[PDB]
């Protein structure tokens, strides 16, 4: 029960939009990875899709508590990618943009004394930094090994 | 193991796009309905979101069997709606457009002898016609009763 800040609700709606795109893209990627027998990549991206659902659930709760409603910006084109490196690099691009939006919203919420929205978003950001770190590390390995040597190292004994 | 028809894969990718939008929109709607204490509407839309996930899983399997990859058209703006009638009417709009695309793809797949893709899509269409019928029936009741009388009839004894 409270009427929240207009711009904070706007940020929460932009962020919930990001979650929906990420849930969609990790879903598709996970399934492609499983098809190619890349078990680890499927397991982690499927796991992080669950994190993203949780984030979207938190955003929706908060928007509704602030007496707003879910209302979304255009969610755009998903750049799925055609090979494993392109897939991961496109996930990293979403995550980096999403983290930038989240830091902007944290700063703003903090500035106008919406500390509960701020703190929710801080917890979500810690999760997103984990999502970024995984992707960066895997893409670093693809650079060091070469893509095909990297894919071969995914094959289980 | 087979290289499928280019246009059939294109249809499967357009249809998988529709599933992703529908999964997103039913997700958000379900949560809004639950917040307003509309248990039946939440339960059914949450249930149909599961059907849509299954449809997207079938599309992805088939695209990958046909040696294609998931590759998506712009998924656009979700028109969430601001009241229950607008929400349902926007779901109906997605469903009607999605069914039109599916009948087009069925006709095409049939015409070029891709009977396995055709038959998969026929099963999905039967599900979509059930999704349409629910929405139509509820919107008919909102017209007959008036929205507020309809919402009041959702309140459980």
Curated annotation (Swiss-Prot), chains A, B:
Cofactor(s), names only, from the UniProt record: heme b; Fe cation
Molecular-function annotations in GO: ferric iron binding; ferroxidase activity; heme binding; identical protein binding; iron ion binding; iron ion sequestering activity; oxidoreductase activity; protein homodimerization activity
SUPFAM superfamilies: Ferritin-like
Binding site for Fe cation 3: 47, 51
Lineage of the species this protein comes from: Bacteria, Pseudomonadati, Pseudomonadota, Gammaproteobacteria, Enterobacterales
Keywords, alphabetical: Heme, Iron, Iron storage, Metal-binding, Oxidoreductase
More details: The internal surface iron site that binds iron 3 is important for the mineralization phase but not for Fe(2+) binding and oxidation at the ferroxidase center.
Effect ascribed to mutating residue 79 to G: In strain: ECOR 30
Result for mutant: residue 19 to A: Highly decreased Fe(2+) oxidation activity. Is also severely restricted in its ability to lay down an iron core
Protein name (database record): Bacterioferritin
Single GO cellular component term: membrane
Positions bound to Fe cation 1: 19, 52, 55, 128
Limits of the Ferritin-like diiron domain: 2-146
Binding residues for Fe cation 2: 52, 95, 128, 131
Functional description taken from the UniProt entry: Iron-storage protein, whose ferroxidase center binds Fe(2+), oxidizes it using dioxygen to Fe(3+), and participates in the subsequent Fe(3+) oxide mineral core formation within the central cavity of the BFR protein shell. The mineralized iron core can contain as many as 2700 iron atoms/24-meric molecule.
Record annotation: effect of changing residue 131 to E: Decreased Fe(2+) oxidation activity. Is also severely restricted in its ability to lay down an iron core
Keyword Iron: yes
Subunit structure: Homooligomer of 24 subunits, arranged as 12 dimers, that are packed together to form an approximately spherical molecule with a central cavity, in which large amounts of iron can be deposited as a ferric-oxy-hydroxide mineral core.
InterPro entries in UniProt: Bacterioferritin, Ferritin-like, Ferritin-like_diiron, Ferritin-like_SF, Ferritin_DPS_dom
Positions of disulphide bridges: none
Outcome of swapping residue 58 to K: In strain: ECOR 30
Regulation: Iron oxidation is inhibited by Zn(2+), which binds at the ferroxidase center with a higher affinity that Fe(2+). The occupation of the ferroxidase center by Zn(2+) also severely restricts the ability of BFR to form an iron core.
A biological-process GO annotation: intracellular iron ion homeostasis
Swiss-Prot/TrEMBL catalytic activity: 4 Fe(2+) + O2 + 4 H(+) = 4 Fe(3+) + 2 H2O; Fe(2+)(in) = Fe(2+)(out)
Result when mutating residue 39 to M: In strain: ECOR 30
Binding site for heme b: 53
Effect of residue 32 to H/L: No loss of heme binding
């Amino acid at each position: 029960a409270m009427k929240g800040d207009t711009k904070v609700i706007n940020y929460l709606n932009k962020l919930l939009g990001n979650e929906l795109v990420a849930i969609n893209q990790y879903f598709l990627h996970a399934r492609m990875f499983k098809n190619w027998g890349l078990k680890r990549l499927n397991d982690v991206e499927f796991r992080e899709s669950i994190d993203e659902m949780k984030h979207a659930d938190r955003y929706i709760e908060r928007i509704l508590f602030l007496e707003g409603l879910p209302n979304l910006q255009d969610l755009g084109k998903l750049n799925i990618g055609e090979d494993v490196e392109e897939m991961l690099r496109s996930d990293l691009a979403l995550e980096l943009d999403g983290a930038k939006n989240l830091r902007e919203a944290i700063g703003y919420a903090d500035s106008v004394r919406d500390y509960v929205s701020r703190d929710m978003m801080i917890e979500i950001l810690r999760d997103e930094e984990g999502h970024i770190d995984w992707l960066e590390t895997e893409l670093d390995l693809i650079q060091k090994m070469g893509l095909q040597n990297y894919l071969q190292a995914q094959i289980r004994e």
